[PDB]
């Protein structure tokens, strides 16, 4: 597991990681994925180990496809470390810009309510929901209805990145 100096330097420059951190992530990545290419089955295995009695299939697939930047069916280390940099160390706006890319499942530039529900449902399917009374049931649908309406300031049934980014930010 030896990363070429030019590659390390370039990946350091492109991320929030130091050169030392990049090389440490590479050693660990190659230890767990000796070929240097993480496939979708291996990615889902990670989440099944977290949540062995949920169903991570949907969430893993959605996130894998965003992480697989060149859409060759594999997460290579350059994709791994750049995805980890943004999701773990980005500013709030950068993290939400990444989340926008995840939620905009048809890549048409807007989040529609069906897309928001698909992600939220994928999350609950994996991790579970909070136990409530049958009459305050924590359903993704009612949660999404609330949040989506709050975010859709112009009520056109679709969320821009600007509308999405302002969702939890205080004014």
């Amino acid at each position: 597991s030896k990363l070429k100096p030019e590659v390390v330097e370039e990946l350091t420059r492109k991320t929030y990681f130091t050169e030392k951190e990049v090389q440490q992530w590479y050693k660990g990545f190659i230890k767990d994925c000796p070929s240097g290419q993480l496939d979708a089955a291996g990615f889902q295995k990670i989440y099944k180990q977290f949540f062995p009695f949920g169903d991570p299939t949907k969430f893993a697939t959605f996130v894998f496809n965003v992480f697989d930047e060149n859409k060759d069916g594999r997460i290579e280390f350059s994709e791994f470390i750049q995805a980890l940099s943004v999701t773990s160390r980005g500013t709030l706006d950068e993290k939400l810009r990444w989340a926008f890319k995840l939620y905009d499942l048809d890549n048409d530039g807007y989040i529609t309510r069906n897309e928001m529900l698909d992600i939220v449902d994928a999350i609950y399917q994996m991790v579970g929901n909070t136990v409530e009374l049958p009459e305050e049931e924590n359903t993704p649908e009612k949660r999404v209805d609330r949040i989506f309406a709050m975010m859709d300031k112009n009520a056109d049934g679709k969320l821009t990145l600007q509308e999405f980014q302002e969702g939890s930010k205080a004014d």
């Binding site: 990670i46 180990q49 999701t87 993290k95 989340a99 949040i147």
Partner: peptide
């Protein structure tokens, strides 16, 4: 106790945290 972050489910932050944690597991 509700998982502290799941209050952000649908806002983007929960998906980001779960994505990051899966990557981290994939490198450890």
């Amino acid at each position: 106790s509700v998982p502290r972050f799941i209050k952000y489910t649908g806002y983007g932050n929960a998906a980001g945290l779960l994505a990051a944690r899966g990557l981290m597991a994939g490198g450890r």
